[PDB]
Amino acid sequence: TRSSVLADALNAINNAEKTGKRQVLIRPSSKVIIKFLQVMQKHGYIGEFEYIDDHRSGKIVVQLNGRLNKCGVISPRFNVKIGDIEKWTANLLPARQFGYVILTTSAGIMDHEEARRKHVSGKILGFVY
Amino acid sequence: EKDPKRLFEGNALIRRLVRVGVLSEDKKKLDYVLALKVEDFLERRLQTQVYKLGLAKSVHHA
Amino acid sequence: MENDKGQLVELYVPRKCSATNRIIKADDHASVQINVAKVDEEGRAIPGEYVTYALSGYVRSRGESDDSLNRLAQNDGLLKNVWSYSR
Amino acid sequence: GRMHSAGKGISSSAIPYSRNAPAWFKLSSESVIEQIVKYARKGLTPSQIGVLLRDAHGVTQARVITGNKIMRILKSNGLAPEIPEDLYYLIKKAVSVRKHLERNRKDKDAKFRLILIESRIHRLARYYRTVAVLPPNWKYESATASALVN
Amino acid sequence: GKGKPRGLNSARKLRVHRRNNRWAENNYKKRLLGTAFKSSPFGGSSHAKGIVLEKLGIESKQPNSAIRKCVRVQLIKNGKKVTAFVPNDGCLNFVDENDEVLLAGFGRKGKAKGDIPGVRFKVVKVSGVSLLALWKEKKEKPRS
Amino acid sequence: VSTKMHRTIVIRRAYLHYIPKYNRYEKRHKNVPVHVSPAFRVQVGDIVTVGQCRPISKTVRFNVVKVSAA
RNA sequence: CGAUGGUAGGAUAGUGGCCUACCAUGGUUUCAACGGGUAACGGGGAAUAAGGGUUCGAUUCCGGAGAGGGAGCCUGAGAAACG
RNA sequence: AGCCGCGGUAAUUCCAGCUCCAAUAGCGUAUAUUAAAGUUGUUGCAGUUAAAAAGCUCGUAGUUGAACUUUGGGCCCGGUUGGCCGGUCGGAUUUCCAACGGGGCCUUUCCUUCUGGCUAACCUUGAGUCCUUGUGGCUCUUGGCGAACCAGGACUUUUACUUUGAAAAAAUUAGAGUGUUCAAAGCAGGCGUAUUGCUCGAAUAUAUUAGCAUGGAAUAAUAGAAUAGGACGUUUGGUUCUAUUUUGUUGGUUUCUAGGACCAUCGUAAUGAUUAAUAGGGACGGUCGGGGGCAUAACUACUGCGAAAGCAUUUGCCAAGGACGUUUUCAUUAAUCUAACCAUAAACUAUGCCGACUAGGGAUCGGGUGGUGUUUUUUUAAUGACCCACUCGGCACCUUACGAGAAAUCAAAGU
């Protein structure tokens, strides 16, 4: 039964952008859904979104541009050290100059360039390109 | 870049290839060694540098 | 794409679609491109001016083409009251 | 999706949005909190109370008109039953099939609908023991079938 | 969900299934049970010396047909016996007997639909002298 | 986890262990026996802290120094 | 016929069921105990290698054991020693 | 002649001559192991017809488990980078900008404190000090303090993970310097007057489990007040236990005093209980079915029920069960239920099974809500049947295919 909420909150997106739609409807929301979304929004991959609430756990309605190829989740959230980001990043990402893998790290959820110049590390969460 | 192992082990590898004369003196950048070729060492042997400098009439007279 | 010096070094930049922002390659042989005619104050047509729409290969095959015309055209004032957002 | 079955339907009540009283309520919390205890002395469950309260005196939810739930009100006034209500109903259902078995023996079928009903009681009993509303020597048995309620 | 567990504290099922059905790789089972001693005529060696019982002539039945010359032998470290092969004295003129010989194996696996039949060994030297040194005639068999 | 002797008890400890090829963890445990002074009153299920002394019995090298209940 | 703990002695360079008296009934286990195989001395290390890994380590350094097979002791600060 | 094979004369391979090819000190043959091998699969394989999903449901250990509880706003200092600026007998930058990371305070809001020294610092009775003359600070004197450091504390849920440190022998491995005549090596060497000399080296990296020191508070666990023996009080009554001190000193007594805990009731705080999963269980109301037990064909597909094997005459009993309906209620998720036969049905097989999402089409079976539509008639309102439209649940069927596949084919065998 329903085990991960984020894992099918990103399966609902690219399943309805392979068919070229413009908006999707997510259910339920989460504190870690929104911050995964807020890092695909300061880089341009999605548009804007709204949070319903209905007193249980809200839904979300997202607006998609044209620019996502794939966004995903990595399901045992393993434990990335600090010398081992660049082996995760040479395998998941299509080329060396774009795309991002994001991490839950002791100073917030962030992408993998942003974690380099703050000099932190944590557990993996997903990717986006 | 600006990583102190790149700057100490880079500027020594570059410095050794010029000191024997394989890298060109305007190609002192680290990406330029990745397109080096195999006869750029073959043209520095004594068998080749004595024939070019006018001492033997052929490469088998070297 | 452009080098250290600055010049573009592709072969040649390709055409984005206009309904779904995809990219239309050199073997998308159903990729329609459609012009309409501007109008004159007397009610005639200028022979040289256009408004251009580019539609991809696969918004047509599913059948979602004409609605994507009415959505696209009505933003440019060509029509009025034939398409509606809140369906 | 229905443990111990294979059906998949969905039909519950849908709780309305507002967390306040309707504007067509003209009573007090004190003039309604005592009808709960006025029917507890009649020996009723919470389950029969609320459906009787809703269909007759128009209280949509005691949860919102008074500050508490039903069982919290009943526990504060000492009218609370001993065994928790849902667990008791699986017991009473379990004897009625058991009493059928002293009169029937050629039913290979409803033998294997009793090991299902009994299986849901150990599931219920682990939870009630762990949260400690049952004392940690509560056990069910066929002898304790005909002992504690019967 | 792939039919294998993915979660984080799952390393014990994963490593105990892998050595469980690692016993179908055909030459890992040969190495741990150690069947090289208990069944092989050599015991795990490159070469082996034996002493020749007698000349044999063997033939190859379906599509091929000719006259393959082999030799019986009895190993010194073991006492068991095998049938070797001697290469291309196709002239039929090098029978030799009660001699000391050195065997080896073929780089073995084959096709015996022409029925080049079931031997597994060869001969690399005899009585202290190589075979090719006699065929190319660089030595001759030592005797007094 | 057991208080059935005279002036000794048995402590259970629990950890995890990392297997590098499979990138994951597995659970393990070890029991230790310690000594209990009669100043403390320890029933099963509690959680103690213990410190090390010179060899007391065949198999004993710790004894309790604090206690906190269940 | 000491297996796990308590009390008092004996013995040792010294702690300790190390041994002896009286008493208690314990301790290990599907998170694999106990038993069987090993053509098994352990590690630093070695061969192959995109990444992950598979297979070796009798053998120049450090640690243990042995002197045909078992047991016993003398001299000494130190040996259950094998020139 | 490794394996496809070439022989039945003269062969575009055996046996020899000639001429060519490959490595040059042959890697020629044998036996082990590694890559090739996504043919051991964590990264990373295989579901119908090719090897391969157990007869069927309940249920151990093991693995895995919904959402929620401090966000935001404002001010200010100080980092190096893109820079303007070059000003020049590449380095200053007068000096400003963009970002990128870091402090700091304030907003209803973080160490929780105590006693001592103790040092700087504000200040207290108050001037020294010297500058426009000062309770000015600086600092002198008494006195309030925060303020840096030692020492006693004083109490306070506990982990997992991650960051930086100390400590992981040399040899070997990655590697800096260095004309062994080059090289593999070695740790040497270089310079002057060579005439009694000075002089640079022998680096650096490689937590790689467990333990130790330290920074952070995301992710995922865990504890706390519900019969209040709850928390704060300088409400008041108590019961104890220590004597450090002073009655020089000593020992012999008890008076306070401080100093430990426990003992009633008297006061103030807004006194203290997360939602109600298109998760699960439990009631409740009208129904449905060749479901089962006791007693007393046709309808059978177009489709009905059951965990499976299976299940057909009416009548009545006994209990069980799905779905629907609802502004009821509780706060859940894994030890392996005549007989016996011989296989004489291509004897269709890599389906915790639960969960989310992704195109159409009409028929039928249950439950519910609608409607100026019909008609038995009570009447063209309604009971009543129909009819129409929606709706949640069922076994099936026909289309296409973006997709998937070795293909046949498939709304999952797709993502």
Curated annotation (Swiss-Prot), chain A:
Q: Where in the cell is it found?
A: Cytoplasm
What Pfam family is a match for this entry? Answer: Ribosomal_S8
Domain of life, per UniProt, equals Eukaryota
* BP term (GO), one: cytoplasmic translation
Q: Name one GO cellular component term.
A: cytosolic small ribosomal subunit
Q: Write down the InterPro entries for this protein, in alphabetical order.
A: Ribosomal_uS8 (IPR000630), Ribosomal_uS8_CS (IPR047863), Ribosomal_uS8_sf (IPR035987)
Annotated family:
Belongs to the universal ribosomal protein uS8 family.
What PANTHER family has UniProt attached to this entry?
40S RIBOSOMAL PROTEIN S15A
Q: What else is known?
A: Present with 40400 molecules/cell in log phase SD medium. There are 2 genes for uS8 in yeast.
Subunit field text: Component of the small ribosomal subunit (SSU). Mature yeast ribosomes consist of a small (40S) and a large (60S) subunit. The 40S small subunit contains 1 molecule of ribosomal RNA (18S rRNA) and 33 different proteins (encoded by 57 genes). The large 60S subunit contains 3 rRNA molecules (25S, 5.8S and 5S rRNA) and 46 different proteins (encoded by 81 genes).
Describe its function: Component of the ribosome, a large ribonucleoprotein complex responsible for the synthesis of proteins in the cell. The small ribosomal subunit (SSU) binds messenger RNAs (mRNAs) and translates the encoded message by selecting cognate aminoacyl-transfer RNA (tRNA) molecules. The large subunit (LSU) contains the ribosomal catalytic site termed the peptidyl transferase center (PTC), which catalyzes the formation of peptide bonds, thereby polymerizing the amino acids delivered by tRNAs into a polypeptide chain.
Swiss-Prot record, chain B:
Q: What Gene Ontology molecular-function terms does this entry list?
A: rRNA binding; structural constituent of ribosome
Q: Does the keyword Transferase apply?
A: no
Report if keyword Lipid biosynthesis is assigned: no
According to its record, what are the GO cellular component terms? 90S preribosome; cytoplasm; cytosol; cytosolic small ribosomal subunit; nucleolus; nucleoplasm; small-subunit processome
Sorted alphabetically, the keyword list is:
Cytoplasm, Isopeptide bond, Nucleus, Phosphoprotein, Ribonucleoprotein, Ribosomal protein, Ribosome biogenesis, RNA-binding, rRNA processing, rRNA-binding, Ubl conjugation
Main location, first listed in the record: cytoplasm
Q: Which domain of life is it from?
A: Eukaryota
The alphabetized list of GO BP terms reads: maturation of SSU-rRNA from tricistronic rRNA transcript (SSU-rRNA, 5.8S rRNA, LSU-rRNA); ribosomal small subunit biogenesis; translation
Protein location: Cytoplasm; Nucleus, Nucleolus
What does this chain do? Component of the ribosome, a large ribonucleoprotein complex responsible for the synthesis of proteins in the cell. The small ribosomal subunit (SSU) binds messenger RNAs (mRNAs) and translates the encoded message by selecting cognate aminoacyl-transfer RNA (tRNA) molecules. The large subunit (LSU) contains the ribosomal catalytic site termed the peptidyl transferase center (PTC), which catalyzes the formation of peptide bonds, thereby polymerizing the amino acids delivered by tRNAs into a polypeptide chain.
Q: Which family does it belong to?
A: Belongs to the universal ribosomal protein uS4 family.
Q: Anything else of interest in the record?
A: Present with 106000 molecules/cell in log phase SD medium.
**UniProt protein name:** Small ribosomal subunit protein uS4A
Gene (name only): RPS9A
From Swiss-Prot, chain E:
Briefly state the modifications made to the protein after translation. Hydroxylation at Pro-63 affects translation termination efficiency. The stereochemistry of the 3,4-dihydroxyproline has not yet been determined.
Which keywords does the record carry?
Cytoplasm, Hydroxylation, Isopeptide bond, Ribonucleoprotein, Ribosomal protein, Ubl conjugation
Q: Main localization of the protein?
A: cytoplasm
Which PROSITE patterns did the record assign? RIBOSOMAL_S12 (PS00055)
What GO terms in the biological process aspect are recorded for it? maintenance of translational fidelity; maturation of SSU-rRNA from tricistronic rRNA transcript (SSU-rRNA, 5.8S rRNA, LSU-rRNA); regulation of translational fidelity; translation
Gene3D superfamilies found in the cross-reference section: Nucleic acid-binding proteins
Q: Which GO terms describe its molecular function?
A: structural constituent of ribosome
Q: Where is this cross-link: Glycyl lysine isopeptide (Lys-Gly) (interchain with G-Cter in ubiquitin)?
A: 55
Q: Where in the cell is it found?
A: Cytoplasm
**Lineage top rank: taxon:** Eukaryota
Q: What's in the GO CC field?
A: cytosol; cytosolic small ribosomal subunit; ribosome
SUPFAM superfamilies given in the database record: Nucleic acid-binding proteins
Q: List every position bearing 3,4-dihydroxyproline.
A: 63
Subunit architecture: Component of the small ribosomal subunit (SSU). Mature yeast ribosomes consist of a small (40S) and a large (60S) subunit. The 40S small subunit contains 1 molecule of ribosomal RNA (18S rRNA) and 33 different proteins (encoded by 57 genes). The large 60S subunit contains 3 rRNA molecules (25S, 5.8S and 5S rRNA) and 46 different proteins (encoded by 81 genes).
Task: Give the similarity note.
Answer: Belongs to the universal ribosomal protein uS12 family.
Q: What else is known?
A: Present with 10600 molecules/cell in log phase SD medium.
Name recorded for this polypeptide: Small ribosomal subunit protein uS12A
What organism does this protein naturally occur in? Saccharomyces cerevisiae (strain ATCC 204508 / S288c) (Baker's yeast)
What gene name does this entry carry?
RPS23A
Curated annotation (Swiss-Prot), chain F:
Q: Where found in the cell?
A: Cytoplasm
Classify the source by domain of life.
Eukaryota
Question: What post-translational events are described?
Answer: N-terminally acetylated by acetyltransferase NatA.
Query: Which keywords appear in this protein's UniProt record, sorted alphabetically?
Result: Acetylation, Cytoplasm, Isopeptide bond, Ribonucleoprotein, Ribosomal protein, RNA-binding, rRNA-binding, Ubl conjugation
In the record, biological process GO terms are: maturation of SSU-rRNA from tricistronic rRNA transcript (SSU-rRNA, 5.8S rRNA, LSU-rRNA); ribosomal small subunit assembly; translation
Keyword Acetylation (UniProt): yes
What does the further note read? There are 2 genes for uS17 in yeast.
How does this chain assemble?
Component of the small ribosomal subunit (SSU). Mature yeast ribosomes consist of a small (40S) and a large (60S) subunit. The 40S small subunit contains 1 molecule of ribosomal RNA (18S rRNA) and 33 different proteins (encoded by 57 genes). The large 60S subunit contains 3 rRNA molecules (25S, 5.8S and 5S rRNA) and 46 different proteins (encoded by 81 genes).
Say what the protein does: Component of the ribosome, a large ribonucleoprotein complex responsible for the synthesis of proteins in the cell. The small ribosomal subunit (SSU) binds messenger RNAs (mRNAs) and translates the encoded message by selecting cognate aminoacyl-transfer RNA (tRNA) molecules. The large subunit (LSU) contains the ribosomal catalytic site termed the peptidyl transferase center (PTC), which catalyzes the formation of peptide bonds, thereby polymerizing the amino acids delivered by tRNAs into a polypeptide chain.
Q: Which gene encodes it?
A: RPS11A
